[PDB]
Design a protein around this ligand. Structure first.
Ligand SMILES: *[C@H]1O[C@H](COP(=O)(O)OP(=O)(O)OC[C@H]2O[C@@H](n3cnc4c(N)ncnc43)[C@H](O)[C@@H]2O)[C@@H](O)[C@H]1O
Ligand SMILES: [Mg+2]
Ligand SMILES: [Mg+2]
Lengths: 8, 327
């Protein structure tokens, strides 16, 4: 994926 | 050298993570919400903290202590935003099995190792602990190899640690900065392990050296769009599509930008511009912030931004402790 971010 | 550079380095990284993560989670609006100023940190800061705490606890790189601190930090808050791959390494290190702490990283991705930017996102602390360029390379590599056994991963961590190391020496032309990094990366990417790793993934040889040469060409151009920067360098989760991008943002933003208000200082401009590239904004901005912080120092860290960041007090304590123990 384009990035890694913590879940909403 | 100065305490200001140590504090600016870790604060800059924290701002990149906190402000970059905020943008990665919520789709002129950027410039508005930064002037408005708690911002939570992610795995970038969680792992940078564990790395620095390990260096302070052992007053040296200790692979077992650092592996244990990474695994324990993960167990304490597994939802900080870790790469889906690296969690396998933490789950192995948490289980009771007798093993070499470097073996889980080596087993990743069918034994090829991770080329993700997670080894580089956390590495700045190495360049605060080790003053010698040889030690910076050695311990950036070893700290990265706890999670990132691919040279495409650990050479990105070495490049980021070298950029912080150079930024700490203060005022430099972009040309001198870039040539120094290119000299080291052409050397490292000519190593048998680097050649082998690149070819086994059907990649260009010398991805870091190629992107550092493209950075020189990009900086020579009168104007370059965000699309051209991202097309040429990347904005992704791979170390080779994020570490050179962070360095580009640092070198580019030494100059004012017609699109970024002149009210912003060079550190703020570097963070805003890196976030404007989109993609893995937490990690690109944390790395651009570490370099910019080491270079501009704590004078360019705005108090209102720093005080909006989760754990900024502990980050400042850890910067001062590194300075006392190692400087
Ligand atoms: C959120 O995610 C990024 C990257 O963090 P990490 O580098 O810690 O995570 P990974 O080790 O999981 O690497 C990221 C992803 O990259 C792909 N990958 C890496 N290495 C390989 C190989 N050898 N083959 C195939 N794919 C590979 C995977 O998708 C892997 O999960 C950072 O911003 C965090 O905050
Ligand atoms: Mg990320
Ligand atoms: Mg993150």
């Amino acid at each position: 994926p384009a990035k890694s971010a913590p879940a909403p | 050298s100065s305490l200001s550079r140590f504090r600016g380095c870790l604060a800059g990284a924290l701002l990149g993570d906190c402000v970059g993560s905020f943008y990665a989670a919520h789709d002129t609006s950027v410039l508005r919400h930064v002037q408005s100023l708690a911002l939570y940190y992610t795995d970038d800061t969680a792992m940078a903290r564990a790395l620095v705490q390990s260096l302070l606890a052992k007053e040296a790189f200790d692979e077992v202590d650092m592996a244990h601190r990474f695994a324990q930090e993960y167990k304490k808050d597994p939802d900080r935003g870790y790469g889906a791959g690296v969690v396998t390494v933490f789950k192995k290190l948490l289980n009771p099995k007798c093993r070499d702490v470097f073996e889980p990283a080596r087993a990743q991705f069918n034994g090829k190792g991770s080329y993700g930017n997670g080894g580089a996102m956390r590495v700045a602390g190495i360049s605060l602990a080790y003053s010698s360029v040889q030690d910076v390379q050695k311990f950036a590599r070893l700290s990265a190899q706890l999670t990132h056994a691919s040279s495409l991963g650990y050479n990105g961590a070495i490049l980021q640690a070298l950029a912080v190391h150079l930024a700490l020496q203060g005022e430099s032309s972009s040309e001198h900065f870039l040539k120094q990094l290119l000299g080291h990366m052409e050397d490292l990417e000519g190593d048998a392990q680097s050649v082998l790793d690149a070819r086994e993934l059907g990649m260009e040889e010398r991805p870091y050296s190629s992107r550092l040469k493209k950075i020189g060409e990009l900086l020579d151009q009168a104007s370059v769009t965000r699309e051209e920067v991202v097309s040429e360098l990347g904005n992704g989760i791979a170390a080779f599509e994020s570490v050179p991008t962070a360095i580009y943002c640092f070198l580019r933003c030494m100059e004012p930008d017609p699109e970024i208000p002149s009210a912003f200082n060079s550190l703020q401009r570097t963070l805003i511009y890196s976030i404007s590239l989109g993609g893995d904004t937490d990690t690109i901005a944390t790395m651009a912030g570490a370099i910019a912080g080491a270079y501009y120092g704590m004078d360019q860290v705005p108090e209102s931004w720093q005080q909006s960041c989760e754990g900024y007090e502990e980050t400042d304590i850890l910067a001062q402790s590194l300075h006392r123990v190692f400087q």
